[PDB]
A paper describes a structure:
SYK-6. On the other hand, DesB exhibits not only a strict substrate specificity but also high enzyme activity for gallate. While LigAB is an α2β2-type tetramer, DesB is a β2-type homo-dimer.
His124, which is also conserved in type II dioxygenases, forms a hydrogen bond with OH of the substrate, which is an equatorial ligand of the Fe (II) ion. Since the His124Phe mutant shows no detectable enzyme activity (less than 0.01 U/mg), His124 is also indispensable to the enzyme activity for DesB. Crystal structure analysis of the anaerobic DesB (His124Phe)-gallate complex showed that the Fe (II) ion was located at the R-site. Gallate is bound to the active site of the mutant, and the carboxyl group of gallate forms hydrogen bonds with Asn387’ and Tyr391’.
Numbering used by the authors:
A (entry chain A): 2 to 410
B (entry chain B): 2 to 412
The structure:
Amino acid sequence: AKIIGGFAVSHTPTIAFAHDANKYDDPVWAPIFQGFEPVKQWLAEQKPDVTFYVYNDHMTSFFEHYSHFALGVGEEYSPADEGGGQRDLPPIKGDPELAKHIAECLVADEFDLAYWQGMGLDFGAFSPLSVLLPHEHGWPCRIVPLQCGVLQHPIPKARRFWNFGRSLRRAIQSYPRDIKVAIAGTGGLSHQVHGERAGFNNTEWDMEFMERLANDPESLLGATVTDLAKKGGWEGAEVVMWLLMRGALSPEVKTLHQSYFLPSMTAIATMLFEDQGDAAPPAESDEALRARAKRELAGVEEIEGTYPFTIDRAVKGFRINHFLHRLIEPDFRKRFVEDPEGLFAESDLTEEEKSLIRNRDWIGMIHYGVIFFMLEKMAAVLGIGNIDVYAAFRGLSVPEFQKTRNAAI
Amino acid sequence: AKIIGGFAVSHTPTIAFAHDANKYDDPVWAPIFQGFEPVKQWLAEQKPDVTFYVYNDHMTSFFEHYSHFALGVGEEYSPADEGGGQRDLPPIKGDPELAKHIAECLVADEFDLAYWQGMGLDFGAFSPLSVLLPHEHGWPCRIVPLQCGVLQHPIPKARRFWNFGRSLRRAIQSYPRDIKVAIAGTGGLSHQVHGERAGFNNTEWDMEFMERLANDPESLLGATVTDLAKKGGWEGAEVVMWLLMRGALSPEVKTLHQSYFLPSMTAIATMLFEDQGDAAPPAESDEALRARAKRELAGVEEIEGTYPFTIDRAVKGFRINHFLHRLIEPDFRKRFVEDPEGLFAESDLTEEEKSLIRNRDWIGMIHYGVIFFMLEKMAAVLGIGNIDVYAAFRGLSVPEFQKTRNAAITY
Ligand SMILES: O=C(O)c1cc(O)c(O)c(O)c1
Ligand SMILES: O=C(O)c1cc(O)c(O)c(O)c1
Ligand SMILES: [Fe+2]
Ligand SMILES: [Fe+2]
């Protein structure tokens, strides 16, 4: 519930490559890693419990279904295979409870979201995190990733990215736990990596952008995609993600550190911001925002025999739901019927999860967090009509359930 | 550019079952199919060019990544395998041009979207569509699907679905083409298909909801998920999709038809709404809306050597982007290096597309509609540094291009 501050850093994959190759005293790379140092120190000293991490996926985990604001709600994240195998880094833990609270708040404020679990984080995340945080066996903090669809136009306007951050601030502050949260905005600065214009940079615009983001961020909010692409290059226009992070910080921040280097394609820049707290009370109190974020499902627990599929339940039921979802694949479902045990022994299912499936325990799976539409698939594959499932839910014989209907179908 | 009207219809998979199992003379189902006939007849007579189709996917094509408003921008859609194999139905054609226009207007109005291509439509689409439209060889109209994330809470508020509809109305009207567009809201009405409460229905609420939706829809906009699940069953609360559709129509509509049947788990309902056009001119003219939708990329064409990855480009490059995306799979990329010609023959790639990859024609791929991030994967798989790709883009040798860099470095 306390925002300690925020940081901005480029996420170009070269940072990771330079790290993995130990170019720490290379004449080109030495002052660059030195640029990351104050951010690295601040993080080790401040010890945030969670980093809210704003990034974009580079057509790896997001392609055929490509969303604007994709909130990671899952228990943990591994490095994505980008075509060269997964980087050797430990998984980083997520925060389902914080992510759900944020989703509730952001939807109440009429932002439209996507929710995701299980997919890998590409270089947009693990390039800068691997240089910012020590990771021998695990990571020093949890993450809540926000993957932003900045690559397929139209994308949200600059002012929308900013307004998301403003609502995000209130969301994090109203979270009823005494934790410390840092916000990260990544990508940028100037660059262009496609077409005959590949290699464009604008150091002059970069410095201006940094200054304005720090000290007058509102003056950036009228910039169009054309403006940002003209000034910073096509891919450099991803800096709207910095705006989102900056919007989540206090209107006035202190700049603890800032650096800038351009050795090759991308302006590798870093900024560190110390949150100053609120200069005045927010328009709506923490207690009031909490009540408002809960109003949609207020009193839902008074509906008996009902198990609303909320984010917490989706996380709880994720392994078993993911498993049953695979029944839409011809080979998997053939195996489910002929050799279920061989399929179980290969899975990551708990013994209890296997047991629920083997027993065809319909109501138990619902209690546990399986969504009905996965059971529907399971029933179909096993030759079991939906009527059987409903009868089990109700504790009735098939005919006695059928009696509650107007016609037996 | 002309909204002729809209229909509301249940999407329960049981409609497809009865249809496929040929049940038009069965005593239970015959009257039900007769309930669909006024909507079927109106579609056949009115001949919309496109139906804007509002539905939800039932954890089939949308699961690990689950979005609120998922707009289908692609060229065609096939039935999804839902665990029983693909229903035997032909592909239905999309409308990428109208989809792109709609996206531009909606983002300008600050709705946050998802774009998708190539994935199957589950029963949410093909159940009612198969009874409403003839399809033995092909479909009579195009579709623009909008898959709504109604299953994983928090979901957008009722008023948000309605405001989406209001903005969608203007988006379709301002589309500079002389076409007829029908709007479909699907799902509902009362039902609950999970838990000890499974089997719940509420016919009185169903009728009142429909009457209010037809004649006073703004009286519904303060309904919470709890209100809607209490009155209509947990899954019955998806009727916010009906609201979105209703939001897209004239403030006054003529309700040509209403039917209602409850044989089993789901209140099977139909409504046909004739659009009454606009009583007064819109708050913002069509001309002004077109310009505002275009103002984010206004003047981007002045930027040389640049190829904005817009929806039209994402559609054009879809097959080749999708192919090169698969390089993230260990088995596919080993095959790419070891037997590319074999991989090509099994693919759906046109010869133009295969040739581009075969020649490692980097700039030609960018011109074609391949996004750089797919070429980055291809380069890496073949052991080529990004530096060679960039030099190829600039029409320079590696050494020549390196000179433009402050430091000539390796990666
Ligand atoms: O090859 C590079 O320097 C490079 C590759 C990327 O994918 C990227 O996003 C970037 O900013 C730079
Ligand atoms: O077995 C059923 O009647 C059934 C199954 C579904 O997946 C569904 O959405 C529905 O409204 C009814
Ligand atoms: Fe990026
Ligand atoms: Fe549905």
